[PDB]
Amino acid sequence: SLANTYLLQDHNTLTPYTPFTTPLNGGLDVVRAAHLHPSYELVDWKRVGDTKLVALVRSALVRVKFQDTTSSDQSNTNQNALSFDTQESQKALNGSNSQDFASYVLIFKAAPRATWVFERKIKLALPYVKQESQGKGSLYKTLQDLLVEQPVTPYTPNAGLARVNGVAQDTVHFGSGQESSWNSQRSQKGLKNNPGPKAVTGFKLDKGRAYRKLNESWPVYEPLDSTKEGKGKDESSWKNSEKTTAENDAPLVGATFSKYLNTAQALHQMGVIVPGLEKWTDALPNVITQLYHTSTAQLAYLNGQIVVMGSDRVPSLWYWVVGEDQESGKATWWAKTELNWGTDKQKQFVENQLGFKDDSNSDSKNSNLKAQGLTQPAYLIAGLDVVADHLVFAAFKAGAVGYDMTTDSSASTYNQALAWSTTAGLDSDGGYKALVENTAGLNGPINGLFTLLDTFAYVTPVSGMKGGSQNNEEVQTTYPVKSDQKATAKIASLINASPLNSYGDDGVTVFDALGLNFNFKLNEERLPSRTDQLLVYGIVNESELKSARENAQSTSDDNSNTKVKWTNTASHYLPVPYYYSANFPEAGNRRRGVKISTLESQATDGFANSLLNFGTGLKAGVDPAPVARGHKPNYSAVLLVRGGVVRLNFNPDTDKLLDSTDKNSEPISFSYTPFGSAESAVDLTTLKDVTYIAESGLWFYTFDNGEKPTYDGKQQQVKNRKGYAVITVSRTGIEFNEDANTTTLSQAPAALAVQNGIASSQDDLTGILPLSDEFSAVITKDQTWTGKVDIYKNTNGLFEKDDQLSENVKRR
């Protein structure tokens, strides 16, 4: 209809466009209309029905503090350790009312002449964590020792991710010089039939990319090679000397860049508060402040409830479930949200690598998440959407491992993180379930280089119940802590700003990230990792969401260790395409080794690395095609990852994940289809919009080149920050209840991503208007007052410019 309007964003303004391609009015300035400070920036917004508009706003002036010490042994005992630093926020203002500059969810009501009236704002309060005095699991204790990696920027090179390998597990349990007694004593050490004495226990934290505490700050600088430069977790060495070294080597615009990169503009673009680079040398604000600012990134509205989640480029430790009626709402911790990983074994894999837990240990400095009875703490959120009165989400599991707190300089695992490869053994039984439930690396390391005669492999040739001479015994695995040190061990928690648990500069980590581990069977099957490059997805109902709100609103008391249970979720191993790397290795050759530092990236999808996977643009959609009599209409959610499109399938009759009877069959709820060279050329970090067209059942992914950082790591102006590209996602394969007898599905219904024909490298995009099923308008800026309008003909998701109408709509 002509009376219909399309809402388009321009920074803080949402302008209504008519099907004549012209704006109806000056648009709604979300920040000005909500009576908010100029520092507020519109992050996300959703039109709800026809009379509602929900917006998400954040300010670069927000300051967060974590109270670590926990003085006396009484006090208020019910005060949150997490609070907004009003004094620092006022300090930052200096470069008229006192405010914390907290993020808000804004509610607007429709008004005549296609206008919006401000209704109310809901404050996104910090999650709750009780300040102790006690120095029953403690999240407070974990947060005191928690280390978070500096965010991975699009300019982070492969060698920058590479960390020197940790100590072998034979050295850990037998000590230097006594490693030779492995075969005879492994049995009495909880390592019966373990064939990997040389399996790496983790990665060195003395050098490389910064790991910082909640109240510490990440540097703007990052090393080119983490095996050679950087100070890792060593904040003192950075502050005292290495800061000035990086400052001289990598200065900001206004100087060889031989050791470090200045990624200031890349961080600002990721939603990291970089003072002096905001719209309206100084160290960046706290890790805790950066985590708050980045966590208020994406929203969804579901029957009076608003859900807010973090960004896809920085890990988030919490999420919001707030009432529309409420004035404010505290966040729910991800560590207190137990998800279904597919199998109980799959949960065990993630949770066992979180840290060390033993009945004999009760040391307060062994503060890791596992010891505190907490679950997976962080996620790299691909997005969230609502469909059939349910919330659908997808995220990559951020790497969360343990680290040794020891002061003993000569200790085996001193100054190192404890992480290992969890790839299923070469001898795993067939089928999806047998592979994911394979015991290889369940409790500790096992994988490494195994030289079978003159053919190598980076995975164990024996696992599960295929050990011993008779191949019937258990191949045991145990945590990398020496038996005598179990009672006195001090393992804390560490969060990686990527889907990787281990950064160990070795072949096994390369094989695990690139999905290069395959069994030596004619029916060749890819061996899955149960900790690296893990995509987490699911459907969540109102009662599951209500539990998350209730868990957030609980103040210390007796529900401090109570967990939220989302059972209709799953996890899937989703590595980066190996072909994104120029020199990808292959197991089974003739010796001819490729580690992280020697891996060469040939990726053109907006990342200097070819190691870490990334997920963006989750959008749900109800299939327009008719289904069989007595069955609900099908719905799926799609998202873009490095190398292809992933489709998530659900059962509409139960509002659960799409499942089948057979366990040998791959899950029909998950599908990954690799996209072509043309779509691999698209910068996935520049996604500006995702739209689903109900009538056609097609998703449209809009990419804006203006979303790129202004300067690269070597402080050079970024090439092609002009233009746009559009990808169309369509359904493929047999659908659920497609016909009368379609009961169970053998194959997972897939998606297909293609560059549709709407592309340019010379103009700034205002937006795209779906004028009809057959036509679409592409609004552009250059200096154009009315905005340059291009008309395209829609041929089932494929587009071709109409020169006749494009000129006609242009010419004055």
Numbering used by the authors: 23 to 117, 128 to 167, 176 to 294, 373 to 398, 462 to 773, 779 to 998
From the study:
M. pneumoniae binds to host target cells by means of a polar structure known as the attachment organelle, and glides in the direction of this differentiated structure at a speed of ~1 µm/s. P1, together with the P40/P90 polypeptides, forms a transmembrane complex called the “Nap”.
After numerous attempts, high-resolution diffracting crystals were grown from a construct, referred henceforth as P40/P90N, spanning residues Ser23-Val1003 that, by sequence alignment, corresponds to the N-terminal domain of the M. genitalium orthologous protein P110. The refined P40/P90N structure, at 2.65 Å resolution, has agreement R and Rfree factors of 21.4 and 23.4, respectively. The sequence of P40/P90N presents two long insertions with respect to P110 of more than 60 residues each (Gly297–Thr368 and Leu395–Thr462 that are referred as S1 and S2, respectively). Both insertions, completely disordered in the crystal structures determined, are found between β-propeller blades II and III. Besides insertions S1 and S2, the structure of P40/P90 presents only three short disordered loops (residues Ser118–Gly127, Ser168–Gly175, and Ala774–Arg777) and the N-terminal domain from P40/P90 can be seen as a well-defined globular structure with two long floppy pendants. The primary scission occurs between Arg445 and Ala446, located toward the C-end of insertion S2. Structural stability of the cleaved protein probably relies on the large interface between the P40 and P90 polypeptides, with 75 hydrogen bonds, 6 salt bridges, and a buried surface area of 10,480 Å2, which gives an estimated free energy of −55 kcal with an expected 100% probability of formation according to the Complexation Significance Score algorithm in PISA32. Regardless of the extend of proteolysis, all P40/P90N samples behave as a single and sharp peak by SEC–MALS indicating that cleavage takes place only when folding is completed and that a unique three-dimensional structure of P40/P90N is maintained.
